[PDB]
Design an enzyme around this catalytic site. Structure first.
Site, PDB file in Angstrom:
ATOM      1  N   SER A 101       0.854  -1.280   0.027  1.00 46.88           N
ATOM      2  CA  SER A 101       0.007  -0.008  -0.115  1.00 46.88           C
ATOM      3  C   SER A 101       0.824   1.386  -0.044  1.00 46.88           C
ATOM      4  CB  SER A 101      -0.880   0.207   1.363  1.00 46.88           C
ATOM      5  OG  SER A 101      -0.128  -0.463   2.392  1.00 46.88           O
ATOM      6  N   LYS A 144      -6.109   3.087   9.410  1.00 48.31           N
ATOM      7  CA  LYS A 144      -5.174   4.043   8.845  1.00 48.31           C
ATOM      8  C   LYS A 144      -5.736   5.511   9.205  1.00 48.31           C
ATOM      9  CE  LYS A 144      -2.942   0.999   5.701  1.00 48.31           C
ATOM     10  NZ  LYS A 144      -2.800   0.543   4.272  1.00 48.31           N
TER      11      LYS A 144
HETATM   12  B1  LIG Z   1      -0.353  -1.535   3.199  1.00 44.53           B
HETATM   13  O1  LIG Z   1      -0.414  -2.797   2.316  1.00 44.53           O
HETATM   14  O2  LIG Z   1      -1.793  -1.793   3.806  1.00 44.53           O
HETATM   15  C1  LIG Z   1       0.663  -1.484   4.154  1.00 44.53           C
HETATM   16  C2  LIG Z   1       2.119  -1.607   3.645  1.00 44.53           C
HETATM   17  C3  LIG Z   1       3.362  -0.474   4.132  1.00 44.53           C
HETATM   18  C4  LIG Z   1       2.853   0.514   4.974  1.00 44.53           C
HETATM   19  C5  LIG Z   1       3.673   1.386   5.498  1.00 44.53           C
HETATM   20  C6  LIG Z   1       4.986   1.418   5.234  1.00 44.53           C
HETATM   21  C7  LIG Z   1       5.372   0.369   3.926  1.00 44.53           C
HETATM   22  C8  LIG Z   1       4.659  -0.344   3.631  1.00 44.53           C
HETATM   23  N1  LIG Z   1       0.808  -2.461   5.126  1.00 44.53           N
HETATM   24  C9  LIG Z   1       0.889  -2.391   6.509  1.00 44.53           C
HETATM   25  O3  LIG Z   1       0.418  -1.729   7.000  1.00 44.53           O
HETATM   26  C10 LIG Z   1       1.727  -3.414   6.982  1.00 44.53           C
HETATM   27  C11 LIG Z   1       0.916  -4.820   7.536  1.00 44.53           C
HETATM   28  C12 LIG Z   1       0.340  -5.574   6.096  1.00 44.53           C
HETATM   29  C13 LIG Z   1       1.095  -5.637   5.092  1.00 44.53           C
HETATM   30  C14 LIG Z   1       0.484  -6.228   4.080  1.00 44.53           C
HETATM   31  C15 LIG Z   1      -0.644  -6.726   3.936  1.00 44.53           C
HETATM   32  C16 LIG Z   1      -1.426  -6.517   5.173  1.00 44.53           C
HETATM   33  C17 LIG Z   1      -0.975  -5.949   6.265  1.00 44.53           C
HETATM   34  N2  LIG Z   1       2.564  -2.894   8.125  1.00 44.53           N
HETATM   35  C18 LIG Z   1       3.249  -3.405   8.514  1.00 44.53           C
HETATM   36  O4  LIG Z   1       3.878  -4.552   8.458  1.00 44.53           O
HETATM   37  C19 LIG Z   1       3.987  -2.783   9.785  1.00 44.53           C
HETATM   38  C20 LIG Z   1       3.414  -2.501  10.910  1.00 44.53           C
HETATM   39  N3  LIG Z   1       3.808  -1.751  11.870  1.00 44.53           N
HETATM   40  C21 LIG Z   1       5.156  -1.128  11.648  1.00 44.53           C
HETATM   41  C22 LIG Z   1       5.762  -1.124  10.531  1.00 44.53           C
HETATM   42  N4  LIG Z   1       5.284  -2.066   9.372  1.00 44.53           N
END
Ligand SMILES: *[B]([O])([O])[C]([C]C1=[C][C]=[C][C]=[C]1)[N]C(=O)[C]([C]C1=[C][C]=[C][C]=[C]1)[N]C(=O)C1=[C]N=[C][C]=N1
Ligand SMILES: *[B]([O])([O])[C]([C]C1=[C][C]=[C][C]=[C]1)[N]C(=O)[C]([C]C1=[C][C]=[C][C]=[C]1)[N]C(=O)C1=[C]N=[C][C]=N1
Lengths: 203, 203
Positions: A101, A144
């Site tokens: 994302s 978010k």
């Molecule tokens: B997005 O796919 O919804 C998002 C990707 C992202 C966010 C911020 C910075 C870089 C990439 N994904 C997330 O929020 C992910 C969890 C996730 C990933 C893929 C599918 C579903 C959910 N966030 C994390 O992995 C995370 C959480 N907390 C701290 C750091 N990273």
């Protein structure tokens, strides 16, 4: 209780060059992730640090290929593919991150770093980018946007196919925010980057 | 009791080119650690030896990318990405080490080794660095400052956001030490590096 043991995350104010404000989903709520990029002289490379998974690295390469294809629509240098090393760092280290994302956040940061134009840091972004420049729908809109409202951000960029999910928000946070709905990454870059360059461009 | 089993930690005195004093946390207690950087002629490579983990290997590259971006603030040679080879060594070789808390130590050691100016060795330091200079707070402060007191070091450099953990210390230790609180790494490099290089330049 004792010494305060956590720091509430808080929005930045001034426009930075090379930096963009993203949003993340954790299993204890949403957080603000900040993506920062440097562009130094070199030979054309791409370091990707900060404990990143493979889906995020592929999304950064897709964003870089889109910017290599459109190098005069945004005022990028004529040959950065061959003279400039890029480093994408997502602080903090020792915390693994994954997921796509973050595509338009990395697109904004990279285009701000290459052409020395600051990026507005009071607008949080989310969305998945493709290789033609299409912005695709993402997941976890509710957490978010909640955590972006908790931290004092009042403008959002969001994919247009996610306005079905803007009905499960609470009324209080939905009155606080200004959602902008996009379907193409050129709109994002035209709305985030300030019009005038500041730094000397990297040769 | 016989032959002593455990050699105690000792602090150095003289300023030295290319080294810097760092602090570490074990579940037994704190420890002093020294970072060493050599800059020999070469073609632009980065060896990282001493059983380092991945997070520490990424801290090294973030510090080096920062220094590649600001190359005339500190008197660095203008093309060291093509001409020198760096080698970061953290003694001793048999013990595995990990974590990003030592970014400010590596940035001081690398800037000292590249600019030929010796770093002061009576100042312990600690702190996580980001790609645009902002220091990030760390953890385990009292064990590290305790171990730096009883090794003979009376000057610390600490992140600004860790001012709140200084009330965990005993009163006599906190009266012994001289804490300096920083936000940017330009402050650290002004406080640590002596002027006037004492070696011929690597070129
Ligand atoms: B997005 O796919 O919804 C998002 C990707 C992202 C966010 C911020 C910075 C870089 C990439 N994904 C997330 O929020 C992910 C969890 C996730 C990933 C893929 C599918 C579903 C959910 N966030 C994390 O992995 C995370 C959480 N907390 C701290 C750091 N990273
Ligand atoms: B930092 O992450 O807290 C620190 C970095 C460091 C200091 C000194 C020398 C090399 C690296 N590392 C540590 O404190 C770690 C423990 C740790 C790891 C991850 C997160 C928090 C804390 N300890 C060591 O690397 C270590 C200590 N003693 C002997 C050998 N290794």
């Amino acid at each position: 209780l004792g010494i305060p043991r956590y720091r509430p995350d808080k929005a930045e104010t001034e426009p930075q060059v090379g930096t963009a404000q993203g949003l993340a989903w954790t299993p204890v709520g949403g957080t603000l992730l900040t993506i920062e990029v440097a562009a130094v002289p070199g030979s054309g490379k791409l370091s990707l640090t900060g404990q990143l998974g493979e889906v995020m690295k592929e999304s950064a390469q897709a964003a870089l290929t889109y910017l290599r294809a459109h190098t005069q629509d945004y005022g990028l240098p004529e040959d950065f593919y061959n003279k400039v090393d890029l480093h994408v760092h997502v602080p903090d280290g020792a915390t693994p991150k994954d997921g796509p994302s973050a595509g338009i956040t990395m697109a904004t940061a990279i285009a701000s770093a290459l052409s020395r134009r600051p990026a507005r840091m009071d607008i949080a972004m989310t969305g998945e980018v493709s290789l033609r420049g299409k912005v695709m729908p993402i997941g976890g809109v509710k957490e978010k946007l909640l955590a972006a409202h908790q931290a004092g951000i009042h403008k959002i960029v969001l994919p247009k196919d996610n306005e079905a999910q803007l009905e499960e928000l609470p009324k209080e946070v939905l009155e606080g925010l200004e959602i902008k709905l996009v379907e193409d990454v050129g709109e994002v870059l035209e709305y985030l980057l300030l019009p005038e360059p500041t730094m000397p461009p990297v040769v």
